[PDB]
CSV table of C-alpha atoms (C1' of nucleotides) in Angstrom, one decimal:
chain,number,residue,atom,x,y,z
A,2,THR,CA,-0.1,0.1,0.0
A,3,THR,CA,2.9,2.2,1.7
A,4,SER,CA,6.2,1.6,0.9
A,5,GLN,CA,9.2,1.7,2.9
A,6,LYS,CA,10.9,4.6,2.1
A,7,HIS,CA,7.2,6.6,2.4
A,8,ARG,CA,6.6,5.4,6.6
A,9,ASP,CA,10.5,5.9,6.5
A,10,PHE,CA,9.1,9.7,5.4
A,11,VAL,CA,6.6,9.4,7.5
A,12,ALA,CA,7.7,8.4,10.7
A,13,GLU,CA,9.5,11.6,11.7
A,14,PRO,CA,10.4,14.9,11.8
A,15,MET,CA,12.4,16.0,8.5
A,16,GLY,CA,13.5,17.9,9.8
A,17,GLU,CA,17.4,18.4,6.9
A,18,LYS,CA,15.9,15.3,4.8
A,19,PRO,CA,16.9,16.3,1.0
A,20,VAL,CA,14.3,16.2,-1.5
A,21,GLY,CA,15.1,13.1,-2.6
A,22,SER,CA,13.9,11.9,0.8
A,23,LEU,CA,10.4,13.0,-0.3
A,24,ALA,CA,8.3,9.1,-1.2
A,25,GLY,CA,8.0,10.0,-5.6
A,26,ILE,CA,11.7,11.6,-5.7
A,27,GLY,CA,14.5,9.8,-6.7
A,28,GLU,CA,17.3,10.8,-8.3
A,29,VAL,CA,16.0,12.0,-11.5
A,30,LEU,CA,13.4,14.4,-10.0
A,31,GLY,CA,15.5,15.3,-6.8
A,32,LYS,CA,18.3,16.7,-9.2
A,33,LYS,CA,15.8,19.0,-11.4
A,34,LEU,CA,13.3,19.5,-7.8
A,35,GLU,CA,16.9,20.8,-6.6
A,36,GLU,CA,18.1,22.8,-9.9
A,37,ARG,CA,14.0,24.7,-10.2
A,38,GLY,CA,14.7,25.9,-6.2
A,39,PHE,CA,13.4,23.8,-3.9
A,40,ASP,CA,16.3,22.0,-3.0
A,41,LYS,CA,15.2,20.4,0.6
A,42,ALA,CA,11.9,18.7,1.8
A,43,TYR,CA,11.4,21.0,4.1
A,44,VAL,CA,10.2,23.5,1.0
A,45,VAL,CA,7.8,20.7,-0.9
A,46,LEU,CA,6.6,20.9,2.2
A,47,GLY,CA,5.8,24.8,2.0
A,48,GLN,CA,5.0,24.4,-1.5
A,49,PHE,CA,2.1,21.8,-0.1
A,50,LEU,CA,1.3,24.1,1.8
A,51,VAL,CA,0.9,27.2,0.5
A,52,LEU,CA,-1.4,25.0,-2.2
A,53,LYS,CA,-3.0,24.5,1.1
A,54,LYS,CA,-2.4,21.1,1.2
A,55,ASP,CA,-5.3,20.8,-2.0
A,56,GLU,CA,-4.2,17.1,-3.5
A,57,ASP,CA,-4.8,17.6,-7.7
A,58,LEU,CA,-2.7,22.3,-7.2
A,59,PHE,CA,0.2,20.3,-5.4
A,60,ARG,CA,0.9,16.7,-7.7
A,61,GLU,CA,-0.5,18.8,-11.0
A,62,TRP,CA,3.1,21.3,-9.6
A,63,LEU,CA,5.4,18.6,-9.4
A,64,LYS,CA,4.8,17.6,-12.6
A,65,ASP,CA,5.5,20.9,-14.4
A,66,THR,CA,8.1,21.4,-11.9
A,67,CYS,CA,10.0,18.1,-12.0
A,68,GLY,CA,8.3,15.8,-14.6
A,69,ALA,CA,7.3,13.5,-11.5
A,70,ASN,CA,4.4,10.7,-13.4
A,71,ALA,CA,0.7,9.7,-12.0
A,72,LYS,CA,2.7,6.9,-9.4
A,73,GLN,CA,5.1,9.3,-8.6
A,74,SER,CA,3.0,12.2,-8.0
A,75,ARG,CA,0.3,10.2,-5.9
A,76,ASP,CA,3.0,9.3,-3.6
A,77,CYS,CA,5.6,12.4,-2.9
A,78,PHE,CA,1.5,13.6,-2.1
A,79,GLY,CA,0.2,11.5,0.2
A,80,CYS,CA,3.7,11.4,1.8
A,81,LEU,CA,3.5,14.4,2.3
A,82,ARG,CA,-0.3,14.5,3.3
A,83,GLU,CA,0.6,11.9,6.1
A,84,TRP,CA,3.5,13.7,7.8
A,85,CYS,CA,1.7,16.9,8.5
A,86,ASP,CA,-1.0,14.7,9.8
A,87,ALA,CA,1.7,13.4,11.7
A,88,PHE,CA,3.7,16.4,13.1
A,89,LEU,CA,1.7,20.2,11.8
B,2,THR,CA,12.0,39.2,25.3
B,3,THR,CA,9.6,36.6,23.6
B,4,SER,CA,5.1,37.7,24.2
B,5,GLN,CA,3.8,34.8,25.7
B,6,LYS,CA,0.9,34.9,22.3
B,7,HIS,CA,4.4,33.1,21.0
B,8,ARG,CA,5.5,30.5,23.3
B,9,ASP,CA,1.8,29.5,23.3
B,10,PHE,CA,1.6,28.9,19.3
B,11,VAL,CA,5.5,27.5,19.7
B,12,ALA,CA,4.3,24.8,22.9
B,13,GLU,CA,3.0,23.0,20.4
B,14,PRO,CA,1.9,21.8,16.4
B,15,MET,CA,-0.3,24.8,15.0
B,16,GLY,CA,-2.3,21.9,13.4
B,17,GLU,CA,-5.3,24.0,13.0
B,18,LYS,CA,-4.6,26.6,14.1
B,19,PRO,CA,-5.5,30.6,12.2
B,20,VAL,CA,-3.0,32.6,11.2
B,21,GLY,CA,-4.7,35.0,14.1
B,22,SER,CA,-2.6,33.4,16.7
B,23,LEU,CA,1.1,33.3,14.5
B,24,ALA,CA,2.1,35.9,17.0
B,25,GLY,CA,2.3,39.5,15.0
B,26,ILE,CA,-0.7,38.6,13.5
B,27,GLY,CA,-3.5,40.7,15.4
B,28,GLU,CA,-7.5,41.6,13.7
B,29,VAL,CA,-6.2,43.7,11.4
B,30,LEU,CA,-2.9,41.8,9.6
B,31,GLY,CA,-4.8,38.3,10.0
B,32,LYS,CA,-7.9,39.9,8.2
B,33,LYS,CA,-5.8,40.8,4.6
B,34,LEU,CA,-4.2,37.6,5.6
B,35,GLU,CA,-6.8,35.6,4.5
B,36,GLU,CA,-8.7,37.4,1.8
B,37,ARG,CA,-5.2,37.8,0.3
B,38,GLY,CA,-5.4,33.3,0.7
B,39,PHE,CA,-3.1,32.6,3.6
B,40,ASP,CA,-6.7,32.0,5.5
B,41,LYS,CA,-4.7,29.0,8.3
B,42,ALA,CA,-1.0,30.0,10.1
B,43,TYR,CA,0.3,26.7,8.3
B,44,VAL,CA,-0.5,28.3,5.0
B,45,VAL,CA,1.7,30.8,5.9
B,46,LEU,CA,4.4,28.6,7.7
B,47,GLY,CA,3.8,27.4,3.5
B,48,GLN,CA,5.5,30.1,2.7
B,49,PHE,CA,8.1,31.2,5.0
B,50,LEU,CA,9.7,27.1,4.2
B,51,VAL,CA,8.8,28.5,0.9
B,52,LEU,CA,11.5,31.5,0.6
B,53,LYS,CA,13.9,29.4,2.9
B,54,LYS,CA,13.5,30.5,5.8
B,55,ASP,CA,15.2,33.2,4.8
B,56,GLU,CA,14.4,36.3,7.3
B,57,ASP,CA,14.5,39.9,4.8
B,58,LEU,CA,11.9,37.7,2.7
B,59,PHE,CA,10.0,36.4,4.6
B,60,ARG,CA,8.9,39.3,6.6
B,61,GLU,CA,9.1,41.9,3.2
B,62,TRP,CA,7.2,39.0,1.4
B,63,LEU,CA,4.8,40.4,5.0
B,64,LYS,CA,5.3,44.0,5.0
B,65,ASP,CA,4.0,43.5,1.1
B,66,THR,CA,0.8,40.7,1.5
B,67,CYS,CA,-1.0,42.7,5.4
B,68,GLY,CA,1.3,45.4,6.1
B,69,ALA,CA,3.1,44.1,9.4
B,70,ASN,CA,5.0,46.2,10.7
B,71,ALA,CA,8.8,45.9,12.3
B,72,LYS,CA,7.7,44.4,15.4
B,73,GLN,CA,5.0,42.9,13.7
B,74,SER,CA,7.4,41.3,11.2
B,75,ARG,CA,9.6,40.5,13.4
B,76,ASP,CA,7.3,38.5,15.5
B,77,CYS,CA,5.7,36.6,13.2
B,78,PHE,CA,9.4,35.6,11.6
B,79,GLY,CA,10.6,34.5,15.1
B,80,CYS,CA,7.9,32.8,15.8
B,81,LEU,CA,7.6,30.2,13.1
B,82,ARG,CA,11.7,30.0,12.7
B,83,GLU,CA,11.4,29.1,16.7
B,84,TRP,CA,8.3,26.2,15.6
B,85,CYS,CA,9.8,24.7,13.1
B,86,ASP,CA,13.0,23.9,14.7
B,87,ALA,CA,10.6,22.7,18.5
B,88,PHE,CA,9.0,20.4,15.3
B,89,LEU,CA,9.7,20.6,11.5
C,1,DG,C1',-10.4,49.3,26.9
C,2,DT,C1',-5.0,50.0,28.6
C,3,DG,C1',-0.6,50.5,27.3
C,4,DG,C1',3.3,51.5,24.8
C,5,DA,C1',5.7,50.0,19.9
C,6,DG,C1',6.2,51.7,14.8
C,7,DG,C1',5.6,54.9,11.6
D,1,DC,C1',-1.6,61.9,16.3
D,2,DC,C1',-2.7,57.4,14.2
D,3,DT,C1',-2.7,51.7,13.5
D,4,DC,C1',-2.8,47.4,15.2
D,5,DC,C1',-0.8,44.1,18.7
D,6,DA,C1',-0.9,41.9,23.6
D,7,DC,C1',-3.3,41.5,27.6
E,1,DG,C1',21.8,-3.4,-10.8
E,2,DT,C1',17.3,-5.9,-10.9
E,3,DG,C1',12.0,-5.7,-10.7
E,4,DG,C1',8.3,-3.2,-12.2
E,5,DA,C1',4.9,0.7,-12.5
E,6,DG,C1',3.8,4.6,-16.2
E,7,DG,C1',3.9,5.9,-20.7
F,1,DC,C1',11.0,1.1,-25.8
F,2,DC,C1',12.0,3.9,-22.4
F,3,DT,C1',12.4,5.8,-17.9
F,4,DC,C1',12.2,6.8,-13.4
F,5,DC,C1',11.6,5.5,-8.4
F,6,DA,C1',12.0,1.3,-5.1
F,7,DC,C1',14.8,-1.9,-3.2
DNA sequence: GTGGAGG
DNA sequence: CCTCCAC
DNA sequence: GTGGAGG
DNA sequence: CCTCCAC
């Protein structure tokens, strides 16, 4: 249902974890994200929060920013959504 | 050194607290913030995070968005900065 | 609705 | 003097 | 560096 | 078939 990568991120405060620690974000996507400016998981969380946690908006932003796909954005989203329900 | 309002916010996860719960943000500023879209403390945290926690950038964004002043932006900023060091 | 900082 | 938050 | 989903 | 993440 959820990747191990997911749980690891949802398990504890991201603090300074890199964006690549985000579920759905690997070396390729992660790389581009950093270049676009979002060079830290928390920065992506900021964008998530800014888009008021809206799934479509966020996932669509991701797809437009680093080029994630259906599974990628879905996982990254659900990942943050859960982290927030856990610590925010 | 820090207002009571501050501590209350830095004490626990903002969760769903309204923007008016933010140190430095009262009924006047808070109101405008909501209208500009940021209708929830966490949304402001998202903007803070997006601006990678930069003091000037954030405080300047605040001043430009709701019209906070020197003390207002300073407190709102220090407020979030601490919350993050405490839960992010 | 007083007190006090910011402007 | 007026604004706006903290209490 | 294999396995498997997304495109 | 190629891309890109999860492991």
